[PDB]
Every structure is written in structure tokens, then in C-alpha cells.
RNA sequence: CGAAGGAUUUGGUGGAU
């Protein structure tokens, strides 16, 4: 997230610095967050540990 | 006119649609809390369209 | 659909097994008025699908049979939910089965000197191994290929056991196939080597040495090619016959070779020194060959409805047999 | 547990469509449109028989009382016919389904549905609905003219509509609205009208 | 225990099959393609060089193959034997491309045009009994450009189209050529006369032809020209090859070729005036591997297919134009089939085990849904789309 | 118990291992089989064995 | 293999009808043997295949895998009428005597048609006939009283009794030809076999076994057992001179080949 | 896009993209805005290419400030999709830099376009 | 090399031991 956030910070920054007619709204910043937040969520949702599947052993069946 | 021409006419009339992939509705869980579920259906159609 | 069989489950579950001539077995839950599962193509539709399907009394195993020479058993495993088990029903699992050729066997051969197993080929493109004891065991040779639908029906086959267990020990010829496939008894699987006629002729005869190191292929164009089983590499090729080679044999001493073809000549060769010992011409085309290694005598099925016996040592006809009223399908030495 | 395997979607369909039918059965408006959310995805994910597509509308429209579900239902029903891609893709709805749809969705309601610029693609349904009007209701023929102007239908769909209306002229009495429907086809794409007339009379 | 709402529950019970049968459906399935391999064409008589070009006969069941062997080998594609009808060796004429031609008006007229990296082009009259019966052949060499020799260095790249002279309403064939500097030279198919010329800025790499019907018995031919590795053009041939439209392909880099389909074209020629149809698809390839697809009905591409990553040396639509095959000669197995209008690549085919080799030529049969793919090894493999 | 041409074979369901076989071949192909405890009824042509 | 999937001379022997597959569609064409007709009937669907070809005295009757029979007038170049059986099983063999027309399905069901009336007369199945690849009608008078049917053996059946009258031990492979050379003498041949068995209809004993150099494809008989011409699989033609006169097994007397000047 | 100045004509962009492709194969190319900045920091950038259609254009306007400080030529191309395609990547690139190498096989062409961009500036 | 993928591991059953 630090790498991603730093990249978007430059995007938001340089609009703040180099814009001639910037609106004092932060819209470029607002949209940048949703990208990082979405990046965080999918990264957060990832599980490093492998899931165990439902064990289904074909147990022995003997006639009664 | 011939029936084959009419067949190619059907085929030309047909139009594309947005197919559904595995990673199309994963983001719904992210925004599943405190949302009017009508709005959830509207988002479903928006992604589907 | 057409109903062919019906049966209920008597294990305390209100289940009905429904069979159809299409080869499909369906299960219904009468209490819930729903379909539990459908078992597809368990038996061939061409042979009547599921002729009979019966639940074993007081039990979750169902026995299914058909006209395709197959008997199978399926078991309903217990549910994986401690609650609502009736809703949550495991699909049927294959338990055990018996089967054989779906069509008359084409060729047969005795697997071992002990006479416990037999190898069998049928027009259904399947190679089966049948036990001759009370166990009545039967298995299908695996056609999964080695890597470095069923194959066409076998039109010639031979087996050896001097070299079982370390490389291939079977050679087979298929109908309308320009090469022969090798198989291994010990692995019960198709082998890793393929032998081609190299003359654009169809394989008509397959033969092997007693030592189990050489594989012999007779082509329809009259060429005889020799491969080594362990490496499947062509070593020797012979060209004397101009018509199809209908029989190849080699002595146990691995010295003198005999070949026969539709052109009616019997070629005698020295395998070791690779020379033409002699050539013998018969009145009629030769159809098949059986070589008795111990006595060095071989019989030939001629188109004049006769069996001509020749001694390889002296290359002369020793006995001729008459009496058959039509072509001779097969023959063997005691 | 399936996803890409197309064989293995099919075993879901017994399970989850039965769930959708039960959800439609629930009087709760929330349950019904949940089934609308469920149904729409499977139609696009897997093509389904028109009979099943037809049976779904009968269940959707049977307990359709809530206004919000009425909005959701009309989006689903159009989408399901969009997925339909076989002969009878735009064939007329039967008598019972047509009666059921108009009762729950008056003509003015769909005219508003066509009116909005953001309307989803529904030309196949409107073609199917358009023919159903001509077969069963003679008074609504004027509404067909309004519907066709609102929505641009596919070329073959326009041909098929022209085909039925040619039969209607031979059977049903000539009317000012009917000739206007023909004159509407005269104004737009003159030549295709002649082809329908040439092939039929 | 022993419209209605429970209708849906009922229909689920009736059947356990839920896929709508594709046999009734006339549009092929989106992601699943039903293809079976058949016997190969060149098995009967192998070619000794790469297959530079393939072409199906418009009506008869014949296939034409050419290559640096300098031989025009013709095969009777039957799918099971594929025996060779006739062959022609042209000494000193490497075959870079070849094609059948049938006069739109005179169905009896049949001709094959072939050329290479040479300053001449050969014509092969198949009319009457020449194809099979005749002991000796009728051939014509086109080697005169009528004062435009500077613009053209070789005849290796060409295509054959139909031109209708509106002032007389007569229709005749035209041979199209690629010039040195954006030049397109237009020649008469039969007489060989130079008719008109079209020029574009930059290096011409490829061109294609589209037909626009006007009325009963009236149609217009449109020439489209593209640049190596980004840029596009267009012309109008029935008004003396003047420009009528300009546009740029968005993201215009990569480009190697251009093609149109959904109507008449070289692979799907018409047999009469009424059969002429407009092409609703336009695909522009690339050596980067992208394919910008445009709906002919500045433009915005509908999709940018990016499955392939190499020289797109062959773009071709199906005769009825719902499938795009995009293939490359750079490396092996570099062939993909794109469904239209979904613009989704089929997954089941091709597989790793699919034998394609260095794909160098592809051809779609006018009917019967046959796909022929040539490779650098001189081998043409045939397939059948079960849907057609 | 399963019919095999002119003879029948009885298999043990535990293992599908053959338990018994018909002592002789029937003159005609068996049409129906009914099993009851130790006795199995085989029908061929106009005779039931 | 040959491109010509199936073929048949006319009874006069002056015109040959052959079927070939163009792309994936079979086309039926007729050419004059004695001496080009560029007109072929085209099957509009790939799945459609012709299983049987028989001449009618100028129409040719075609059996197909669908389960119906087409009557085709070569002059007009269209199918005049289509005889459709109730079932969809493919037709294995067909034979004709005047108005009488008999065909068999892969379900092993016999069917009878009338050319003049365009009607199905009867359809029956006879036990002990598990398979049926060959049907031949015996030439007795001007009516059909018996039928010869073969799958791997040969069987003779009576129409009125609807039962087998006699069985002959045939080849191991499926029977490919069942032509009746004369009365009480009909030849039989099987796929992938070099031997032809001539059987006596009344007695049932193999009079002779004619042996060819290689596998047989087609058979032609001249007069009344005067001569038999058999097309071998290798592409050679063998002629049997008086096969109905050691004695059990006979070989070809004359062999004919075609080779180009080049070789 | 008034901020993007100078903007190359149709002809020049074709030559620039051709050089960009050759640099990509020779691994002479650093693609992406931030890499372009890194090259100026070391002074290893021979010249820098930017896309005018980038939105917001502000995210690349800093490179001109760096470029003029270090006397390195720079140019603007109309399409960002075209530039990234020329780079040899599956994604659009708003900025790219040609690294300095006097031992490269494409030095003459690179120096040629640099002169044209210098004239454009 | 190559007809609708390849590499490893593993549950269950059957047959021998």
C-alpha cells in the first residue's frame, strides 16, 4: 500500500502544484483514494494460507 | 428473395452483450453493508450491462 | 424416455431408482418430490441401456446390469450434514463391477505357461485379460499412451514371456493401421514403442523371438522389418516377398527364420548371418502360419483348403492334410 | 464451485432456480427481487430454453404486487429475452403470458419504460410484445405505432412485424391506425416493406 | 399425500436438460466452438516449400495452394481423401500469392492470378475444359504498366475485385497492386490495361476492398489502404479512384494489415449482382498483437483483441462473418479465433496439442464451414466447424 | 444370478466372486430368471428348470 | 481409398451413377459409360449421406442415413418423390422388382413400398435376424415369394410365412454382396475377404469357393453363370470363366490392370 | 490540450514512435512517467516523450520543468495509447525516455530525431 | 514432437503378495 499510495500521492500532488485553474475540491484526490481503497480491499481479501477442502473419504461400505 | 438471405439478416441484426466473468461481482461484498438492496439490484444490472 | 427398470430403496429412505433404455439411471425422492441425481450412460444404449437395476434389500447399494456385458454396483454414501440429511444426499459412488467384451472376441492368446490368464481382443477395440481360475478376474488393458478413442481392432497379435517385466513383451497389429503397437503384461498398459512397416504397406503379420529381444512385422507390400523391443529401433529389413507377408516365425535357437506370403512362396533365412537359405513355392496362396519351436515343424493354411506341414531343417513338405470343405479359419499345434 | 465448467453450471440450475421460485413465492418484496437478482445472472451466464424463460415470467408476474419489484421485474423480463437466441427469439408471447403481463404492466407503463433514455436493450421483447398485441388485441394497434417510434428495433424484427401486419390486413378489416402503421413503414425503409409484400402477396 | 406461480417449479421437474439445443440456434455459441479435424489437403501430394497462399474456389470444391516451390497445386477438398486435380510449375516465378477468380457477369469464366517478387504476373484460364481435360494450357503474362513502371517494383502483393462501369452498367474484374510510395495501381483483369491510380502518404503495407450496393443492379467498389505500424486510408474506385473519406485507427500503432467482412470479399465472392453485400466489420491488425475491430455500420474501435503478441500476418473473417481468425508467421501455434460481435476469443480451440506450426496462410471455405491452415513446413491442415 | 446364453452364473454381492455355475447347458436360451433362497428358477422354451 | 463412396451401373450397363463428397456435402452424379454431365444433385446438409444406390427401369433410388428413400429423376435433376419410413434408422440395403420395393433399416425391420402407388404396404421383423446389411429378392416369376438376407451368415425368408425357411453358413466378416447368379445358385462375398461362396438355395451346400488375388470390392455377373467379374481392393479386375462347371476352390483365369505410360 | 506545447505533427510522431520501438527492443527505453523522472535525476535521458491526451495533463507537466533545467529535449505526442503500444506494453504509457548510450546500434536515428525535436523547441 | 493441453501429489475400490 505504501508503494501504491506513494504513486497516487504524486498524482494528487502534481495536480495540486502544477494546475493553473485547480478547483479547491480535491476531486482528483477523492477518486485516487477509491483506487487505493479498492487495491487495499482485494489485497486484504487475499488469504496466504491455503484453504482446506471438505474431506470426502470413500469410506468402506460392507453389506449387512 | 431467399431464406438464406433472411438468415444472414437475422445474424446481422444480432448484437453483442457483456459476458459475465469470475471477477465481476467480487466488489459487491465490499459495498454490501447498509445499502438499499434495490440499489444492489441496480448495481447488478449496471455491471451486467 | 422409455422405462426399462424400476426399484425402490429399502434402507429407510423413500427413494426410487428409475432406469431407461437410453442408458440413464435416475433417482427420485418420493417424500420430497424431487430428483436426487441422474447417472448417465452407465450402460450402452445400443445394447438396451439399463436392462435391470435393483436396490439390495435393506441397503443403500444398487446393482445395475445391461446388454453390454457389464455388471456394476453403486453405493449411496452417508450425508455430510448431521442435520437435514434427507435433503443433503451424497450422489451415488461406483463401488465394484465385472465386465467383458461387448462383441465377440477376435483373437485370443495364453498369457503364461502356468495357464492362469488369457489375452483377448474384440471388434469393440478393447484388449482384455481374463483369468481362467474360479476368481474369474477380468481387466482391460490401459490404452493411455506413454509420452516422450480406442485403437482400431487388432488384426494380429503375439506374446512372449522370456522378457516380461523390464520392457514391452507384446506386439499387436490393428486393422487399417500402418504400424504396430506394443503392450506390457506386467503394467497392463499400452507400451511406449511403435513399429512401422516403412514400405507404405499395412501390417499383416507380427512375430517375436523366444529371447524376447526382436519384434517382427510383416507388411502388405512384402517387406519384413525387425525392431528391438527395449529400444523400439529398427535393426533389419528384408525384401523377398512381393505380396503381403501372412506369417513370420523364428526358431528358439534364433538362427533360422521362416516367412510366408500370399504370393505362395516360403522363404528360409539365416537370422544370424542374414542370408537366403532357400525358397519354396507352394501351389496356392498361404493364409496363416504356426511354428512349433520344439519340433521345428510348421503348418501352413493354403487357399486350396489344405494344411501343409514343412520341416524347417530340410525345407521339404513332410505332411499335407485334406478334408476341409472351405477356407480354414485357424489352426494350432498341440 | 463450478465457474467456467459449462457442464457444471447445469447442476446448479435445479438448485438455485428452485430457490428463486420460492423467493418469488414469498410475499415480501425483498424476497421477490432477490430472485430477480438471482435469475438475471443465470440467463446471461448460461443460455436457457424459452419454455423455462417463459415459465419464469409466469412466476415473476404471479405475485408481483410491490411497485419496486414491478420496476425490477420489468428489467429482468427484458434481459431474459435478450439472452434468448433461438427460433422464437422474438415470437409472440402466448395468450396467458400476454394477458398476465399487460395486467401487471399497463401499456402506458411500458411507454414510460421506452420513454427513458437510459432504457436497457429490450428490442426482442418489444418485438415479441408487438406481435402479441396484433394477434390478441385489435384496439392496441395504435399503441404499436407509438412503441415502434420510441424504440429502434432490429432489421429482422422490423421485417417480422411487417410480416404479421400484412396478414392482419388480409384478415382483419383495414383501419386508419393500421394503414398508419404501414405508412410508418413506408416512411422508414421503403424497400424492405416491398420485400415483405413481395414474399407475402 | 397423493398464470400459476408454481409454473417455474414445474418446468424444472419436467426436464434435467437445461441447455437450449445449439442445433436449432443459427448463431454459434459464444465461448464454445465445435471443431473436428479432417484429413489434410497436401497429404496426397506434398509441397516442397512453405504454403504462401490458400484460396477456395468460389463454387466448385477445389483448393489452390502456392509457394516458393513455384507450383500452383490444385486439390479437390473432400475432407476424406483430398486428391490432387492438377498442378502447374512456373519456372522462375516464386508464388507469393494466388487466387481464384470468377467473372461476376459471366459465371462460365474462371481464372487464377498468381505473382511473386517479380515484375510480371501470370493468368491461368480455367474456362471450359482447361482445368482438367486439356493437355496444354492457356496462360497470359501481364508485364506492361503503361508508363507507370516507376511506381511499381513487383507484383507480389495484389488482390482481385469487381468494378462496375456505371456509365455503361457493365461489370468487369480489376487487379489491384501495391506501389513503392503509397501507390496503388489499378489494372484490367482481362485486357491488363491501366485504369486508375490511388496515392497515400507514407508506406503502403496492405489494402482491402468493400462493396456498397446502390440499387437493383448498381453497386460501388471502395478501396481501403493501411500503413505499416499505425495508419489507415480509403478511396472510391467508381469515381476514378478519388478519396471520399479519411480517418485514423485509435491507438494506431502495431498495424500490419486490414480486412473487411460480413459481406462480399475475396474469400466470400458473390455469384451475381444481387448477392453483393456490405461488410459490417473492419479489423486492423498489428505486429504488436493488438487487433482494433471497428463496426462499419473519428471512429472508436469496438474492441482491442490482445491475445496474440506477434506479427499478425493473416486477418480473415468467416464468409458469413461471425468469426475472426487472427494468425502469425513469427512463431508456432500463433493462431486465435475471435467470436463476433461478442469479441471473445474461443478457449477450447486451439490447444497446445493442436498442430499448426508456423502459420503462413489461412482460408475459409465459401460454404460448409471448412478451415484450411498452411504452415512453413508446406503442410495444410483442414478442420470443420460443426455449427455450419 | 445372471443369464449367460444357455447357462446362468451366481455372483456373491460382497465381492462379485463366482459361487456356483449351472451344471449343464440348457437346450434353449434362458428367457427369465427367478431366485428364491437356495433355489433358482430358469425358464427356456416350454420348460422351466 | 477411392473418392467414389458408392457407385452402380444401370442394368443396360450404359450409364454409371456415382456419389462423391464435395467439401462436406455429398453430390450424386451420372455419367455415360459408352462414349460430360456437370449436373450433380447436392445434399444440402452435411449429416445427410447416401447408404444405397439402385437403378430403376430413368430414375435412381437412393437410401440415406436419415431413414427415408428418395426417387431421383436424373433428367430433371431433382428428387421426384421421397419414401419415408416411420422410423429414423438408416437404410442398410434396398432391392426392386417392378413396382415392388423392399428395404431394411438398422433396426432390422423390413419394409415394402410401391413405386406406382407411393405407399408403405407392410413392415415386419423376423426373429433370428439380429443384424441385416444385405437384402436381395429372389427372381421367381413376376412376384416376390422369398427373400435372401445376410448379416454374417445368409438366411432365406418367406414373405407370406414371415419366417426363415433356410440358413447358410456365411463369412466371418459382414456380407458385402449377395447377388443371385442363377436359380439355386447365388454368390456371396464379405468385407475384407478374398473368397466368394456360391450356395445352392434348395440344397444349401457350398458348390464352390471362388478365390481372388486380393480383397473384393464389387461384383458383376454375365448371362447365367457365364462369367463373373470382380473388382479387387488393390485396383485390379479378375474374371472368372465358367465358375459353375480342385473343383471346390477355383482361381481367376484372366486379370486386367490399368497403368499409365509413366508407370 | 493547450498546455501540451510543442506538439509534434503527424509526420514527426511517426519517426518518434519508430525510434521508441527500436529503443524498446534494444532495452534502451525507460517507460512510464516516474522512470522518466529518474532518468533526468541521473542525467541519463537523451530525450523524453510525453502524451498530450493524458487526463489530467498535470501528472506529466513536471517533466518539462525538469527537462528545461537540464537542457534535455522533450516532445509531446497526441495519443497515449499509441505511445504505450510503441513501447511494447499492453497498457498506455503517458511518458517515455530514451537513455543515453553512445555505443548503441540506433544512435544515428536517435540523434536525428533529437535534432528535429530541438528545432521544434 | 504435437487430432478437443502438459507436470506433481493424493483419497477410495479391485487383484495379487
Swiss-Prot record, chain A:
It is found in: Nucleus, Nucleolus. Interacts with SIK1/NOP56 and NOP1. Interacts with the trimethylguanosine synthase TGS1. Component of the ribosomal small subunit (SSU) processome composed of at least 40 protein subunits and snoRNA U3. Belongs to the NOP5/NOP56 family. Present with 34700 molecules/cell in log phase SD medium. Required for pre-18S rRNA processing. May bind microtubules. This is Nucleolar protein 58. It comes from Saccharomyces cerevisiae (strain ATCC 204508 / S288c) (Baker's yeast). The lineage of its organism: Eukaryota, Fungi, Dikarya, Ascomycota, Saccharomycotina. The chain holds residues 359 to 422 of 511 of the full protein.
UniProtKB/Swiss-Prot annotation, chain B:
Transmembrane segments: none annotated. It is found in: Nucleus, Nucleolus. Interacts with snoRNA U3. Interacts with MPP10. Component of the ribosomal small subunit (SSU) processome composed of at least 40 protein subunits and snoRNA U3. In the absence of snoRNA3, forms a complex with other t-UTPs. This complex can associate with pre-18S ribosomal RNAs. Involved in nucleolar processing of pre-18S ribosomal RNA. Required for optimal pre-ribosomal RNA transcription by RNA polymerase I together with a subset of U3 proteins required for transcription (t-UTPs). Present with 6560 molecules/cell in log phase SD medium. This is NET1-associated nuclear protein 1. The chain holds residues 848 to 896 of 896 of the full protein.
Swiss-Prot record, chain F:
WD repeats lie at residues 1-21, 31-49. It is found in: Nucleus, Nucleolus. The WD repeats are grouped into two tandem seven-bladed beta-propeller regions. Interacts with snoRNA U3. Interacts with MPP10. Interacts (via WD repeats) with UTP18. Component of the ribosomal small subunit (SSU) processome composed of at least 40 protein subunits and snoRNA U3. Involved in nucleolar processing of pre-18S ribosomal RNA and ribosome assembly. Present with 2020 molecules/cell in log phase SD medium. This is U3 small nucleolar RNA-associated protein 21. The lineage of its organism: Eukaryota, Fungi, Dikarya, Ascomycota, Saccharomycotina.
UniProtKB/Swiss-Prot annotation, chain G:
WD repeats lie at residues 13-44, 45-82, 170-209, 211-245. It comes from the Eukaryota. It is found in: Nucleus, Nucleolus. Disulfide bonds: none annotated. Present with 33100 molecules/cell in log phase SD medium. Belongs to the UTP5 family. Involved in nucleolar processing of pre-18S ribosomal RNA. Required for optimal pre-ribosomal RNA transcription by RNA polymerase I together with a subset of U3 proteins required for transcription (t-UTPs). Interacts with snoRNA U3. Interacts with MPP10. Component of the ribosomal small subunit (SSU) processome composed of at least 40 protein subunits and snoRNA U3. In the absence of snoRNA3, forms a complex with other t-UTPs. This complex can associate with pre-18S ribosomal RNAs. This is U3 small nucleolar RNA-associated protein 5. The chain holds residues 2 to 286 of 643 of the full protein.
Amino acid at each position: 500500500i505504501a508503494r501504491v499510495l506513494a504513486a497516487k500521492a504524486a498524482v494528487s500532488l502534481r495536480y495540486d502544484a502544477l494546475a493553473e485553474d485547480r478547483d479547491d475540491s480535491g476531486d482528483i484526490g477523492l477518486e485516487s483514494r477509491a483506487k487505493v481503497e479498492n487495491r487495499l480491499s482485494q489485497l486484504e481479501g487475499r488469504d496466504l494460507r491455503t484453504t482446506p477442502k471438505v474431506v470426502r473419504e470413500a469410506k468402506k461400505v460392507e453389506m449387512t | 428473395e431467399d431464406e438464406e438471405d433472411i438468415a444472414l439478416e437475422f445474424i446481422n441484426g444480432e448484437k453483442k452483450d457483456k459476458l459475465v466473468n469470475m471477477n465481476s461481482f467480487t466488489s459487491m461484498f465490499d459495498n454490501i453493508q447498509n445499502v438499499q438492496m434495490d440499489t444492489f439490484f441496480d448495481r447488478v444490472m449496471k455491471v451486467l450491462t | 424416455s422409455r422405462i426399462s427398470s424400476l426399484s425402490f430403496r429399502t434402507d429407510g429412505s423413500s427413494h426410487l431408482s428409475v432406469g431407461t433404455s437410453s442408458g440413464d439411471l435416475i433417482f427420485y425422492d418420493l417424500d420430497r418430490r424431487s430428483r436426487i441425481h441422474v447417472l448417465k450412460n452407465i450402460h450402452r444404449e445400443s445394447y438396451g441401456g439399463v436392462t435391470q437395476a435393483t436396490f439390495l434389500n435393506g441397503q443403500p447399494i444398487i446393482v445395475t446390469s445391461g446388454g453390454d456385458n457389464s455388471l456394476k454396483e453403486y453405493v449411496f454414501d452417508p450425508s455430510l450434514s448431521q442435520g437435514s440429511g434427507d435433503v443433503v444426499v451424497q450422489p451415488p459412488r461406483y463401488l465394484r463391477s465385472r465386465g467383458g467384451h461387448s462383441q465377440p472376441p477376435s483373437y485370443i492368446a495364453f498369457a503364461d505357461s502356468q495357464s492362469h490368464f488369457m489375452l483377448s481382443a474384440s471388434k469393440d477395440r478393447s484388449l482384455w485379460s481374463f483369468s481362467l481360475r474360479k476368481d474369474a478376474q477380468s481387466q482391460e488393458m490401459s490404452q493411455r499412451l506413454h509420452k516422450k478413442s480406442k485403437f482400431p481392432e487388432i488384426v494380429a497379435l503375439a506374446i512372449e514371456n522370456a522378457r516380461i517385466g523390464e520392457w514391452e513383451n507384446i506386439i499387436t497389429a490393428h486393422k487399417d493401421e500402418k504400424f504396430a503397437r506394443t503392450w506390457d503384461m506386467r503394467n497392463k498398459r499400452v507400451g511406449r514403442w511403435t513399429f512401422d512397416t516403412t514400405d507404405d504397406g499395412f501390417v499383416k503379420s507380427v512375430a517375436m523371438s523366444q529371447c524376447g529381444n526382436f519384434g517382427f512385422i510383416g507388411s502388405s507390400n512384402g517387406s519384413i522389418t525387425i525392431y528391438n523391443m527395449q529400444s523400439g529401433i529398427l535393426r533389419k529389413k528384408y525384401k523377398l516377398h512381393k505380396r503381403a507377408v501372412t506369417g513370420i516365425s523364428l526358431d528358439g535357437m534364433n538362427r533360422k527364420m521362416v516367412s510366408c506370403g500370399l504370393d505362395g512362396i516360403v522363404g528360409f533365412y539365416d537370422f544370424n548371418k542374414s542370408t537366403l537359405l532357400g525358397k519354396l513355392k507352394l501351389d496356392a496362396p498361404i493364409t496363416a502360419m504356426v511354428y512349433h519351436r520344439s519340433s521345428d515343424l510348421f503348418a501352413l493354411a493354403l487357399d486350396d483348403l489344405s494344411i501343409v506341414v514343412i520341416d524347417a531343417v530340410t525345407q521339404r513338405v513332410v505332411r499335407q492334410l485334406w478334408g476341409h470343405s472351405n477356407r480354414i479359419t485357424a489352426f494350432d499345434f498341440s | 464451485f463450478n465457474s467456467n465448467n459449462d457442464e457444471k453450471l447445469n447442476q446448479l440450475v435445479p438448485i438455485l432456480l428452485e430457490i428463486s421460485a420460492k423467493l418469488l413465492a414469498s410475499k415480501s418484496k425483498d424476497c421477490q427481487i432477490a430472485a430477480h437478482t438471482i435469475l438475471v445472472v443465470f440467463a446471461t451466464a448460461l443460455p436457457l430454453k424459452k419454455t423455462i424463460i417463459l415459465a419464469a415470467m409466469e412466476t415473476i408476474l404471479s405475485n408481483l404486487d410491490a411497485k419496486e419489484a414491478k420496476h425490477s421485474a420489468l428489467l429482468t423480463i427484458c434481459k431474459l429475452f435478450q439472452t434468448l437466441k433461438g427460433q422464437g427469439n422474438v415470437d409472440q408471447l402466448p395468450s396467458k403470458i400476454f394477458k398476465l403481463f399487460d395486467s401487471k404492466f399497463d401499456t402506458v407503463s411500458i411507454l414510460t419504460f421506452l420513454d427513458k433514455e437510459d432504457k436497457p436493450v429490450c428490442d426482442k421483447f418489444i418485438t415479441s410484445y408487438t406481435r402479441s398485441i396484433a394477434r390478441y388485441d385489435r384496439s392496441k394497434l395504435n399503441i404499436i405505432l407509438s412503441l415502434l417510434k420510441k424504440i429502434r428495433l432490429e432489421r429482422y424484427e422490423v421485417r417480422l412485424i411487417i410480416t404479421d401486419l400484412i396478414y392482419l390486413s388480409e384478415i382483419l378489416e383495414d383501419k386508419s391506425q393500421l394503414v398508419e402503421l404501414f405508412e410508418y413503414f413506408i416512411s422508414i425503409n421503403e424497400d424492405l416493406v416491398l420485400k415483405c409484400l413481395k414474399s407475402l402477396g | 399425500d397423493e398464470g400459476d406461480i408454481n409454473a417455474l417449479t414445474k418446468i424444472l421437474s419436467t426436464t434435467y436438460n437445461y441447455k437450449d439445443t445449439l442445433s436449432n440456434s443459427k448463431l454459434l455459441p459464444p465461448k464454445k466452438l465445435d471443431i473436428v479435424r479432417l484429413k489434410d489437403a497436401n497429404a496426397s501430394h506434398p509441397s516442397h516449400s512453405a504454403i504462401q497462399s490458400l484460396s477456395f474456389h468460389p463454387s466448385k470444391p477445389l483448393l489452390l495452394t502456392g509457394g516458393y516451390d513455384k507450383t500452383l497445386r490444385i486439390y479437390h477438398i473432400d475432407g476424406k481423401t483430398n486428391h490432387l486435380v492438377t498442378s502447374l510449375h512456373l519456372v522462375g516465378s516464386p508464388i507469393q500469392t494466388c487466387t481464384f477468380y470468377t467473372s461476376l457477369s459471366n459465371q462460365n469464366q474462371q481464372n487464377i492470378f498468381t505473382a511473386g517478387r517479380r515484375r510480371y504476373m501470370h493468368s491461368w484460364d480455367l474456362s471450359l475444359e482447361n482445368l482438367t481435360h486439356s493437355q496444354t494450357a492457356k496462360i497470359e503474362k501481364f508485364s506492361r504498366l503503361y508508363g507507370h513502371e516507376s511506381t511499381q517494383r513487383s507484383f507480389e502483393n495484389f488482390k482481385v475485385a469487381h468494378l462496375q462501369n456505371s456509365q455503361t452498367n457493365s461489370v468487369h474484374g480489376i487487379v489491384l497492386l501495391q506501389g513503392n510510395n503509397g501507390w496503388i495501381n489499378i489494372l484490367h483483369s482481362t485486357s491488363g490495361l491501366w485504369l486508375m491510380g490511388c496515392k497515400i502518404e507514407g508506406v503502403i503495407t496492405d489494402f482491402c476492398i468493400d462493396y456498397q450496393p446502390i440499387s437493383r443492379g448498381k453497386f460501388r467498389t471502395i478501396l481501403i489502404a493501411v500503413n505499416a505500424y499505425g495508419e489507415v486510408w480509403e478511396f472510391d474506385l467508381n469515381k476514378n479512384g478519388h478519396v471520399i473519406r479519411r480517418w485514423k485507427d485509435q491507438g494506431g500503432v502495431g498495424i500490419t494489415k486490414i480486412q473487411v467482412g460480413g459481406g462480399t470479399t475475396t474469400t466470400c465472392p458473390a455469384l451475381q449482382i444481387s448477392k453483393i453485400k456490405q461488410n459490417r466489420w473492419l479489423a486492423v491488425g498489428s505486429e504488436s498483437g493488438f487487433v482494433n475491430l471497428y463496426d462499419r455500420n473519428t471512429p472508436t474501435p469496438v474492441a482491442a483483441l490482445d491475445q496474440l503478441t506477434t506479427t499478425i500476418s493473416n486477418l480473415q473473417f468467416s464468409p458469413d462473418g461471425q468469426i475472426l481468425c487472427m494468425a502469425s508467421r513469427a512463431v508456432k501455434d500463433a493462431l486465435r479465433l475471435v467470436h463476433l460481435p461478442s469479441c471473445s476469443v474461443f478457449s477450447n480451440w486451439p490447444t497446445s496439442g493442436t498442430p499448426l506450426g508456423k502459420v503462413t496462410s489461412v482460408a475459409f471455405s465459401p460454404s460448409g464451414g471448412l478451415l484450411a491452415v498452411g504452415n512453413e513446413q508446406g503442410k495444410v491442415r483442414l478442420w470443420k466447424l460443426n455449427h455450419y | 444370478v445372471t443369464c449367460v446364453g444357455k447357462t446362468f452364473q451366481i455372483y456373491d454381492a460382497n465381492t462379485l466372486h463366482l459361487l456356483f455355475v449351472s451344471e449343464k447347458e440348457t437346450p434353449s436360451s434362458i428367457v427369465a430368471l427367478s431366485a428364491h433362497f437356495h433355489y433358482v428358477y430358469a425358464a427356456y422354451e416350454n420348460k422351466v428348470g | 481409398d477411392s473418392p467414389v463412396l458408392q457407385s452402380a451401373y444401370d442394368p443396360s450397363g450404359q450409364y454409371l451413377c456415382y456419389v462423391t463428397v464435395a467439401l462436406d456435402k455429398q453430390r450424386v452424379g451420372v455419367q455415360p459409360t459408352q462414349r460430360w454431365n456437370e449436373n450433380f444433385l447436392y445434399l444440402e446438409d452435411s449429416k445427410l449421406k447416401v447408404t444405397c444406390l439402385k437403378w430403376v427401369n430413368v430414375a435412381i433410388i437412393l437410401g440415406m442415413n436419415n431413414g427415408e428413400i428418395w426417387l431421383y429423376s436424373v433428367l430433371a435433376n431433382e428428387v421426384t418423390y421421397k419414401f419415408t419410413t416411420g422410423n429414423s434408422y438408416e437404410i442398410k440395403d434396398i432391392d426392386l422388382m417392378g413396382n415392388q420395393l423392399w428395404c431394411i433399416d438398422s433396426s432390422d425391420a423390413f419394409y415394402q413400398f410401391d413405386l406406382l402407388q407411393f405407399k408403405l404396404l407392410q413392415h415386419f421383423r423376423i426373429n433370428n435376424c439380429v443384424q441385416l446389411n444385405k437384402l436381395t429378392i429372389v427372381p421367381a416369376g413376376d412376384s416376390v415369394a422369398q427373400l435372401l438376407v445376410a448379416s454374417h451368415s445368409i438366411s432365406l425368408i418367406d414373405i407370406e410365412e414371415k419366417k426363415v425357411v433356410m440358413t447358410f453358413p456365411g463369412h466371418v466378416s459382414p456380407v458385402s454382396t449377395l447377388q443371385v447368379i442363377t436359380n439355386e445358385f447365388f454368390i456371396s462375398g464379405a468385407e475384407g475377404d478374398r473368397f466368394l461362396n456360391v450356395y445352392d438355395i434348395h440344397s444349401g451346400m457350398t458348390k464352390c469357393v471362388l478365390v481372388a488375388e486380393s480383397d473384393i470390392k464389387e461384383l458383376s455377373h454375365s448371362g447365367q453363370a457365364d462369367s463373373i467379374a470382380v473388382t479387387t481392393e488393390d485396383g485390379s479386375l479378375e474374371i472368372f470363366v465358367d465358375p459353375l462347371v480342385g473343383n471346390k476352390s477355383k482361381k481367376s483365369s484372366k486379370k486386367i490392370q490399368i497403368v499409365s505410360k509413366d508407370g | 490540450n493547450p498546455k501540451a506545447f510543442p506538439l509534434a505533427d503527424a509526420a514527426l510522431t511517426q519517426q518518434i514512435l519508430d525510434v521508441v520501438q527500436q529503443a524498446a527492443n534494444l532495452r534502451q527505453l525507460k517507460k512510464g512517467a516516474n522512470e522518466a523522472t529518474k532518468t533526468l535525476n541521473r542525467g541519463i535521458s537523451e530525450f523524453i516523450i510525453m502524451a498530450a491526451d493524458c487526463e489530467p495533463i498535470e501528472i506529466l507537466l513536471h517533466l518539462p520543468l525538469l527537462c528545461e533545467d537540464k537542457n534535455v529535449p522533450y516532445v509531446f505526442v497526441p495519443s497515449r495509447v499509441a505511445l504505450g503500444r510503441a513501447c511494447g506494453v499492453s497498457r498506455p504509457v503517458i511518458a517515455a525516455s530514451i537513455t543515453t548510450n553512445d555505443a548503441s546500434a540506433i544512435k544515428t536515428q536517435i540523434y536525428a530525431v533529437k535534432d528535429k525535436i530541438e528545432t521544434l523547441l
